[PDB]
Design a protein around this ligand. Structure first.
Ligand SMILES: Cc1cc2nc3c(=O)[nH]c(=O)nc-3n(C[C@H](O)[C@H](O)[C@H](O)COP(=O)(O)O)c2cc1C
Ligand code: SF4
Ligand code: SF4
Ligand code: SF4
Ligand code: FES
Ligand code: FES
Ligand SMILES: [Ca+2]
Ligand SMILES: [Ca+2]
Lengths: 178, 238, 127, 437
């Protein structure tokens, strides 16, 4: 996998000392994610030799974190906030609806193959709740029932997220509700 | 050398000594799960709790006797109700998700969990005593799944001392085992299948419980039933 | 309720699906453990559909990729559970009258299960 | 006026979030056009390393990571002149529920951060710093990298800053979602390439942190506050706040209120002021407010609470504690149990799994109780046990996470025990009001 982009290893290994090659484990794992949708046992075997340690050690390290997936994820992996602040904004009703609709459990992937789901923790934008993070990019903030069907229908039409019109207005570091 | 008062006994003891080893040296006792002869102490399971005074001024929070060093003129209480009550609870927590295998479990009466359970557990307060508070579904996972032809691993039993994984990186230097996910869900696992290092057998002798077991001698006799014969291995010069 | 009885009945089923998928796609099914509240049941009665409590669909090396279990008869907050080891995915299936076996609001049908099993087998089996 | 700054004063000067939300606020040019790294320059050329410590020890700055430790003092522990490589680390793993102040400082005014770490770097003899940002903060990550490159170019970073014989570079390490990575000692292991477990603190980070070398760790807000402190004297900083809570704090409020979000304010301004003047007051009736982080014990919605000074002392001796200053209001329309049900299930999911007390205690016993009692499957007995578990855990774990899971529960019982006994005694689940539009 990383045989290809040698210029990437080069650069990231550079960020850390000669002895702490292990440091690279996180960012390497990271790439394999944003590229392939999920991390394969092979990738770990690789990253292992690559970073100078055992496949076991790298497995333990990878299975620790929440972002990395280890089973295939849809094109658009909706991660929903469920922590308190978003709960008082309706976070559960959203999750019920989003699931009930798509008919997918967390482990699964929609028939059409583009939607996985997963509850996550507080994403540090409580003021703009409820919040959804899509893949590895900017929060689709203030998911109202309406706004949601808009984010959904938008991706469902192939439209690249970073330019989908989201009905209603939603603030920056301060937000007005009406 | 340092002056340390355990409970009622006073003992001399080198400077970089463990409060734990202090206690045992004085001839006392404390629940011991994760620390081990020759392995790095970390205060993992939290059994070897004690109370400490150091001037008498009583430290606010209980300490992990296995990772706190001794200091000159230190009192170490290992009998206070406050202490027993704490060990009692810690034991309760350890047993909270365990699997109920004993009669069937190959760890026989040579199991650190049982012994300490009986030794310190079930706190006497001062009516029908309550053996178990936790009435929910226990943690169920993988079971009796052999890592190699010589070691059979039972994940359910494991108590998450760090003994085995810690041993591997330290003694042999062959990291072929380590916890997987996190929280109540973590477990011991591998990706180096044969258990490579020529020194894997030792994890069987360290594992406080019946998770890591000698498969070479699975289901032969219970541990007391055996006739022990101390001797010397003469396969090689050591 | 007597919905408890129906849950175990369904758990018997969930197991039958597992054994099916097992011999079907050529991969090992294994009873991981039997109910303690059966083993150490003595003169005491027992009218549960099976003894089997924890089961797995393991791979070539034995490493499980699917893990199912139901809660013992004497426990509280009963649920039948699915777990894809190594991949932080946990499913709690309950039972609703008339609707059936559900993971929340969504039904857990032989179809949906078999789907989950595959996703796991293909991506998570070591051998 | 006459004496001391504590809120909506006219002599209050916004510093940190001054430029946040202003079009093009991250450009190196936008920072210099507004008096950029000109403070970093002065300090490096004139004042000595130790001297800059004393100005911060003098300022009264306390760790804005929620900690609350005197940051001047903190740097005072770093080794003098020993020749070892020293590391500085920015704890941008902001992930404690209800807290989102550090996000926008990264997203919009990164150069402020960089300048801060330069100062702080020089202060502790750190030739290299790392910034650990949670892997959910996409924008902040993208922005930081950019800014670090710009600054690396025009010579504000690296080789030999400002002609002065001090060098300083930054690297950005993205995390991957795990609350625990925010414990300083855990952060080091995560970044260092290991499983994210907190370390044995008998051997401290100050003398052995990142790869064994003497490192120091400060929060985004802390390091950013270092810039205005070095600019307008420590005395300017100190003319703000209470007797032990000096400076300006970035408070943030969330939950059912008119306009939530971040509000820069002088340490000590009243909850009322924040909840009402800036945030524009609740939209529901409120019953309790979580003062600092999530890890802070809830307080009841009483007059005397609203009129309390948000400080590292007034909240202290009031039962709770000021964490990250990230308030969360809770409506009477949602059961207090339902709220803790949630918070604990968070810590339960977020535990690392080193401790028995936490791995099994909170993540095993505790969470399940709430489930029982919160489906009206609980009896009076259950409550009493959840009650008893607390003191068995709080005391001794390995890291403060468990403490964080038990306090807010402990606290909730202290002020709402009745709410728990209700759902139990009456076998009613928690209420499910409709909460989203
Ligand atoms: C369990 C635990 C979790 C923490 N999580 C965070 C966090 O998410 N974000 C953060 O900024 N600090 C967090 N901290 C605080 C770190 O200890 C903190 O960044 C460090 O003490 C800050 O230094 P400072 O307060 O001088 O800035 C956490 C601490 C603990 C013990
Ligand atoms: S590890 Fe010990 S306590 Fe556990 S079932 Fe086995 S013999 Fe019993
Ligand atoms: S397998 Fe045994 S030695 Fe290893 S962590 Fe589990 S209890 Fe400890
Ligand atoms: S208190 Fe919890 S999160 Fe902290 S070290 Fe212990 S098990 Fe890990
Ligand atoms: S609670 Fe959802 S972002 Fe903080
Ligand atoms: S033995 Fe000291 S805590 Fe485990
Ligand atoms: Ca090249
Ligand atoms: Ca197996």
């Amino acid at each position: 996998f990383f045989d290809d982009k040698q210029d990437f290893l080069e650069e990231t290994f550079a960020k850390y000392p000669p002895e702490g090659r292990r440091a690279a484990i996180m960012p390497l794992l990271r790439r394999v994610q944003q590229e392939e949708g999920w991390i394969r046992p092979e990738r770990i075997e690789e990253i292992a030799r690559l970073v100078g340690t055992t496949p076991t050690e790298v497995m333990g390290v990878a299975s620790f974190y929440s972002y990395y997936q280890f089973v295939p994820t849809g094109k658009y992996h909706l991660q929903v906030c469920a922590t308190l602040s978003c709960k008082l904004a309706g976070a559960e009703e959203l999750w019920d609806y989003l699931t009930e609709t798509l008919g997918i459990g967390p482990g699964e992937v929609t028939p059409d193959g583009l939607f996985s789901v997963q509850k996550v923790e507080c994403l540090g934008s409580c003021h703009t709740a409820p919040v959804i993070q899509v893949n590895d990019e900017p929060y689709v903030e203030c998911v109202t029932r309406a706004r949601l069907e808009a984010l959904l229908a938008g991706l469902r039409a192939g439209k690249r997220l970073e330019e989908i019109e989201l009905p209603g207005k939603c603030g920056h570091h301060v937000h007005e509700v009406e | 050398m340092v002056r340390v008062k355990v409970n009622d006994r006073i003992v001399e003891v080198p400077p970089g000594t463990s409060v734990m080893d202090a206690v045992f040296h004085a001839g006392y006792d404390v629940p011991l799960f994760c620390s081990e002869k020759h392995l790095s102490p970390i205060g993992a399971c939290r059994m070897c709790l004690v109370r400490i005074g150091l001037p008498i001024q009583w430290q606010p929070k209980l300490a992990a006797s296995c990772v706190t060093a001794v200091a000159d003129g230190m009192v170490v209480d290992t009998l206070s109700d406050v202490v027993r009550e704490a060990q009692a609870g810690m034991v309760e927590f350890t047993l909270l998700n365990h699997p109920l295998d004993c009669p069937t479990c190959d760890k026989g009466g040579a199991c650190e969990l049982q012994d300490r359970t009986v030794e310190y557990g079930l706190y006497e307060k001062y009516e029908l005593p309550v053996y178990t508070r936790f009435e929910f579904t226990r943690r169920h996972v993988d079971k009796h799944h052999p890592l190699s032809p010589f070691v059979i691993l039972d994940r359910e039993r494991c108590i998450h001392c760090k003994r085995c994984v810690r041993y591997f990186e330290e003694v042999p230097g062959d990291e072929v085992l380590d916890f997987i996910e996190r929280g109540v869900h973590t477990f011991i696992g591998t990706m180096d299948f044969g258990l490579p290092s020529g020194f894997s057998g030792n994890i069987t002798d360290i594992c406080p419980v019946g998770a890591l077991l000698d498969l070479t001698a699975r289901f032969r006799a219970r541990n007391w039933e055996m006739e022990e014969t101390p001797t010397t291995c003469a396969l090689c010069p050591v | 309720a007597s919905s408890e009885r129906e849950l175990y009945e369904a758990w018997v089923e969930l197991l039958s699906w597992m054994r099916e998928y097992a011999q079907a796609k050529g991969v090992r099914f294994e009873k991981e453990a039997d109910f303690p509240d059966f083993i150490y049941r003595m003169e005491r009665p027992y009218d549960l559909p099976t003894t089997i409590m924890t089961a797995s669909l393991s791979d070539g090396l034995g490493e499980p990729f699917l893990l199912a279990d139901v809660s013992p008869r004497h426990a509280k907050l009963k649920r039948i559970g699915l777990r894809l080891p190594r991949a932080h995915i946990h499913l709690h299936a309950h039972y609703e009258p008339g609707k059936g076996l559900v993971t929340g609001k969504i039904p857990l049908t032989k179809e949906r299960f078999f789907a989950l099993a595959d996703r796991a087998r293909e991506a998570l089996a070591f051998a | 006026t006459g004496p001391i700054l504590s809120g909506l004063d006219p002599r209050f000067e916004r510093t940190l979030y001054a430029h946040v939300g202003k079009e093009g606020s991250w450009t190196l040019d936008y920072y210099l056009r507004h008096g950029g790294y000109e403070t970093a320059k002065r300090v490096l050329k004139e004042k000595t390393p130790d001297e800059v410590i004393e100005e911060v020890k003098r300022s009264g700055l306390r760790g804005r990571g929620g900690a609350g430790f005197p940051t001047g003092l903190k740097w005072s522990f770093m080794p003098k002149d020993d020749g070892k490589q020293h590391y500085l680390i920015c704890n941008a793993d902001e992930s404690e529920p209800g807290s989102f102040k550090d996000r926008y400082i990264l997203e919009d005014v990164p150069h402020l951060l960089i300048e801060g770490m330069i100062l702080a770097g020089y202060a502790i003899r750190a030739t290299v710093g790392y910034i650990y940002v949670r892997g959910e903060y996409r924008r902040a990550a993208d922005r930081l990298e950019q800014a670090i490159k710009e600054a690396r170019a025009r010579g504000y970073l690296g080789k030999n800053l400002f002609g002065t014989d001090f060098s300083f570079d930054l690297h950005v390490h993205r995390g991957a979602g795990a609350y625990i990575c925010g414990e300083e000692t855990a952060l080091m292991n995560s970044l260092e390439g290991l499983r994210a477990n907190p370390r044995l603190k008998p051997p401290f980070p100050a003398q052995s942190g990142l790869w064994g070398k003497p490192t120091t760790i400060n929060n985004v807000e802390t390091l950013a506050s270092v810039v205005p402190i070095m600019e307008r004297g420590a005395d300017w900083f100190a003319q703000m706040g209470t007797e032990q809570s000096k400076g300006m704090k970035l408070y943030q409020i969330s939950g059912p209120v008119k306009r939530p979000g971040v509000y820069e304010l002088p340490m000590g301004t009243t909850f009322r002021e924040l909840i009402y003047e800036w945030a524009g007051g609740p939209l529901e009736p409120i019953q309790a407010i979580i003062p600092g982080g999530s890890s802070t014990p809830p307080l009841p919605f009483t007059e005397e609470v609203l009129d309390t000074p948000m400080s590292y002392e007034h909240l202290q001796a009031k039962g709770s504690m000021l964490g990250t200053g990230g308030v969360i209001l809770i409506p009477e329309r949602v059961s207090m149990v339902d709220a803790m049900w949630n918070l604990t299930r968070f810590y339960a999911h977020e535990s690392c799994g080193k401790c028995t007390p936490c791995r099994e205690g909170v993540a095993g016993f505790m969470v399940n109780l709430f489930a029982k009692i919160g489906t009206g499957q609980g009896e009076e007995k259950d409550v009493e046990n959840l009650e008893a578990l607390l003191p068995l855990i709080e005391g001794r774990s390995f890291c403060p996470l468990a403490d964080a899971a038990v306090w807010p529960v402990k606290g909730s019982l202290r002020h709402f025990k009745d709410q728990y006994l209700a759902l139990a005694r009456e076998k009613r689940p928690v209420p499910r009001p409709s909460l989203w539009r």
